[PDB]
Amino acid sequence: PSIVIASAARTAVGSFNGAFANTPAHELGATVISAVLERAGVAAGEVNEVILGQVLPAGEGQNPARQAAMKAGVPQEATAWGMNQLCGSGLRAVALGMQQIATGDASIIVAGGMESMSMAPHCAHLRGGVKMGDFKMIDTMIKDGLTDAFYGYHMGTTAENVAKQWQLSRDEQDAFAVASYNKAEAAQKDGRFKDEIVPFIVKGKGDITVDADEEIRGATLDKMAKLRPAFDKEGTVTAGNASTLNDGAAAALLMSEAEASRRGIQPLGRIVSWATVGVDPKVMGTGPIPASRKALERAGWKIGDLDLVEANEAFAAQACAVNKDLGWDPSIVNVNGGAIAIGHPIGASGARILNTLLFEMKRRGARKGLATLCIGGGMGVAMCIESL
Amino acid sequence: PSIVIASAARTAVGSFNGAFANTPAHELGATVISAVLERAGVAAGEVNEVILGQVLPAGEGQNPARQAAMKAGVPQEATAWGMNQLCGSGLRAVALGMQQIATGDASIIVAGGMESMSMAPHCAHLRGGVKMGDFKMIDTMIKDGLTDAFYGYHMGTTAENVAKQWQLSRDEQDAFAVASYNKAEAAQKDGRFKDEIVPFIVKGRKGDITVDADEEIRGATLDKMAKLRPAFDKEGTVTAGNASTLNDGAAAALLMSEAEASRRGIQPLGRIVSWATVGVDPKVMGTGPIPASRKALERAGWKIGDLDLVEANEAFAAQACAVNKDLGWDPSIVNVNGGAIAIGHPIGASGARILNTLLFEMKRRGARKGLATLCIGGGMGVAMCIESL
């Protein structure tokens, strides 16, 4: 069969300890699950399963995907579960949900991701007991999200390795970062994010409506060039040319093409292929290169056939290398900005860029699109979408 | 296409703060991944993906499934990811791996689960800062594993609801518990667990220790069982004796198509013929296996009377009694080697663990049609039907 994405939605990407500083991830997920149902004309009672990628669920309780679905009104007869492939969790959950319908084990899937890096706690193993001496409380965000398990250094150090192997200077990375901020600021002023964003009510001394990405700001090349390196003491990656820590959620609604036709739904696009490949963890930023090539081969497309591309900009150094290797037209890649300016909610980033890719394809009439991300531990994932 | 299970393996189920008290889950997972490869004659370089269910990964680092796969020798070109559907993660990961091969996106999958509840840390959100007063360090095992998010009480309280709704007395629950211990001790003495268990070497500073047997299997008496106080409700029926324990362990299986296994001369353990997952009310999450098993049997085209062997995970004695009563299958074919009440319940790996016991017991006695099923916290159930080859 053929699987389509009938609708999509996402929250505003909040800043670290910002708008969603005390909002649990499943509360953000419930808002997005409710949104994709209303935008497609599908009642919650018709959902079979909810697949939400999430990387930092410590302290959220039993199965936060189930909590988000129940809060969204999905009936108890349906099932829900989370999955963790780091930064590709949000996009991989869509591929997994697509397979549920392809094998005939489900009819309607809500797939996506959610992440609240502000709510990540500090932890320590204390069952054995500390007989003597000092011990460390571990930041679960750094440990389970931003630190390579094999080599021990931060993910930003991996971007420094890509910068050396591809010989990307500090000036070329700052130019990529400033260009990313300007494309995002222009898209926000023109309202190109209003379609995909669903407003979220932060209930507090009065409720607050969060409707815009609080990370999108105006950047200047001079202020960027003054920043000190954030990882290597004599390195190239800074806080300006690297993605930020963020909160948010995003999801999509999946069904077969015949099911959408019977319901009179005009889908956002049809999933034509997908792929996931592993690379060396030292250069995990090069993940999207073999993943995109494998997805295009599975779809039968050449790189020149793509009308629009959404590649997640974890770091300026990795994103420059991905565009250089694949050699696609940079004018069709992240036309509304990227994670360097909008933000990077790890569990939801895969579904976030998939939202931007779908609405921009319908807005400009693009026929063939591709979304791809790099994954910590040395992996990449990509998906090809054709418009309907 | 048709997907088969070419081989399977599991570690010994360790006790809480016992043999694996300081062994991370991925070290247990790597041992099982290496085992299913050796038992099938398949090199690690042929694995496409590793899907490991895990419920308590806090503090273990980035994607423990990837760590376990790399330590097992799986090449970096392959992919790996974890999934969390609580107690059914281990069995659901097999169902997900079967779909990768069914859709043609992979050829060889290693699927299973791993859990180290002893290594679960205590946590607290400290970014905002505590200006004054006391705060609580939260046990991640209790919070994210054994506590219902909607009603707030322990999973044992949900079993009390099943005991009340089904009118299961304390005596019927203790009789089920002792019967579970006796079936497990007999299977252990007869060596019916040696085929599925892969030995694990616990490397320590003062000499290494080989863990080869389930550390929870012991002799139980009805007299000592009847004296135990209720562990959740002050005037309830669920005790520490008739409830499953907290444990560590890992289990996995190797998946491939039937034609691929035929080309390699592999004699598979069984064929996955159907599977299903259904949700129920969280108040009575133990009743999950009832609609899940019925849906799996219909998808397989089997009647309940067609089943030759059944493995139903015994989260609680009260929950397991209700499942056998409703489904009405022959209790002599259900958990013939014991259950989680005596063997243990490592949440993330328990789904694949009972799938291991079901596969090896089917081959030794020549059973044709089998079924594995579990209950899932939050009100869900999962079941899988296997046919021998």
Next chain:
Amino acid sequence: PSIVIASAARTAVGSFNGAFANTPAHELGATVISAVLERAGVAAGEVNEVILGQVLPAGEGQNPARQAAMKAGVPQEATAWGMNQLCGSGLRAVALGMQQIATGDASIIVAGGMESMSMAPHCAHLRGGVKMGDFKMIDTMIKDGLTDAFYGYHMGTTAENVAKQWQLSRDEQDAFAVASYNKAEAAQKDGRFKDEIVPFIVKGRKGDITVDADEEIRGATLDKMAKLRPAFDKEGTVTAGNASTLNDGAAAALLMSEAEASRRGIQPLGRIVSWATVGVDPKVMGTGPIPASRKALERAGWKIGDLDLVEANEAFAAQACAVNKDLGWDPSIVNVNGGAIAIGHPIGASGARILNTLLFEMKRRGARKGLATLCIGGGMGVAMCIESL
């Protein structure tokens, strides 16, 4: 023998998590110890011992009094130690230093107190290990400073007990609080605190800051006081406005014999003529100053009518009203420059703090006989009688 106070000094009393939010207590103590030596013309090599009262020393390292004395330039030949009688630590340390000289075991003592309640950490006993369940991180400031060990409630609840037995309404407590703020606001503008305060340099990463004035002194109106919610009892009288605050600071004095001061040409601030410490019921700890002051006056041979100036620590508005009513001294001579309700309450240093205000104000107006007194948690009181020279 006769013991005199040759000099005195104190830091500005900082707000909780304010100017000294990251300043250790011994750094505040070093500034005051060096100050009392420079104000008296005495080299550090002449100090015999340093006695610094401190209540919350957890996490500051080995013997913070020794650290404060060494950082102040006192040579290693001298000795230093801390003592803990809660809120009366600062004043009791002066009485102890007086006894060292009286018994002939020392010649020159630096005595006082220091407290940094902002730097108090959260703690938990973790050696035995938490096998399962949640536990609480204890605020050492609340536990070891502001919580009665026998009854378990906050010190503010003891003030509620004083309010009931003495029939103290909210209006009389707010009127005392507003009167305390106004006397402190008037004294600060007139510069009556400049002599006793030594400036403290808060060295920071983005420029240094000089702290020279008490940041807790604010303008209070009786209307704003009546709008405050009760802070302890849900239907009580003590609020955050009529109770002292949590603060950081240090204060000290320089002690020597009267003949020693004469040989060095020092004009002393005053002569210690008597002191006393008495215990009371912990339920009504606020009445501590009543029997302690009576015993000190009896030991000195003074009547209440002989006192020209009185400093009674205002831990709570309810406690200070009961002390003034029972002892019956002229309220116009009690805390003429305000009290802890407006200035602040650094627990370890509060005893020496009110001694600083009493000494400098006595010389400013030519008072002959003075008395300082405090209430102590756990049901104790301490008082000292001072005569001008």
Next chain:
Amino acid sequence: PSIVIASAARTAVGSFNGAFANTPAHELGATVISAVLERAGVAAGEVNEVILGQVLPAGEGQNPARQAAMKAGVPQEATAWGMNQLCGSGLRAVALGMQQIATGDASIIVAGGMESMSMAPHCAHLRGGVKMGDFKMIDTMIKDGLTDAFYGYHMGTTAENVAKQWQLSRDEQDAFAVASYNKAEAAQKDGRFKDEIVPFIVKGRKGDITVDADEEIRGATLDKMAKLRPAFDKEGTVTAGNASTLNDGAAAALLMSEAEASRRGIQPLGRIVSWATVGVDPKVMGTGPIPASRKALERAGWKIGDLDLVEANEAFAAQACAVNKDLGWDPSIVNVNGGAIAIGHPIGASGARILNTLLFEMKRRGARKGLATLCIGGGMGVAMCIESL
């Protein structure tokens, strides 16, 4: 102005995380306060003040000295407070109580120390908030007890500095340690500790346990001593065998004037003749007892040859060897029953502990002149001279 010690007592010195692993210090302190009152025939209502040295009071509540006195039956009218001069706190509290009676401010004092190093918690300053990254939970026992605030290394490193200045080999330190173990093993078998030790009832959920013997006394052999690796310096001399251990316990004495004991028919253990405290370089804090003992003897009018019994705290074998070498007193009269290397070193109570051993051993053999002394972290020493009656 003559002060005598009417009675004394101490608990069994428990091992780190041993018998008193969950016993708070004030509970041990209460047992000793009750014992010295019955051993002297003094009612609790006659005690004026309780002075208890304590070094690690974090998490123990408001003023543990007051809690210990209240639990021992001392009335609320009495006063109590703690003091901290590290390892010399227990002995210094006796000197402070002696001064209260000498200055006429008290008649009957209970002085001593208490310490439960097992109950010391881990702490961290969390008020400002941890925005990102990991932080350290600090062990209050290591930080506030065993770490030099000026140089940052362990107290065992300071002993290495003393071993270097006196050129003390590993062989000479291990021989000194074994001699202390053997002298302690002989004293326990001969029952020379029963008079001073008061039994403590450890009330638990699973039966009460009576602790009446020091559990660290084991008896050592030089072969096992020479095989131990250095505990501080990678190529050092101090090992776990020749260094004192971490322990829990309490000890106290009862002070009064000589006319008071004669008026009550009390026969005192001994008369306090003099005391002294001196500071030294913190790098060589082990040399503390050398100027302190010489100063006390000079103040008492005694020559070193006059001492019939000497109790010098063996913080480390390297430190104790240098002290015996400098004063040159007869090694057969120094620590005749062993020392802290074998019995243990409870920081807050160690000063009063060696004072207990000295008083009872003086009576057992009829010694007339004794001396107790300890070294103090941060570069200090304290000593006291006792004359029998």
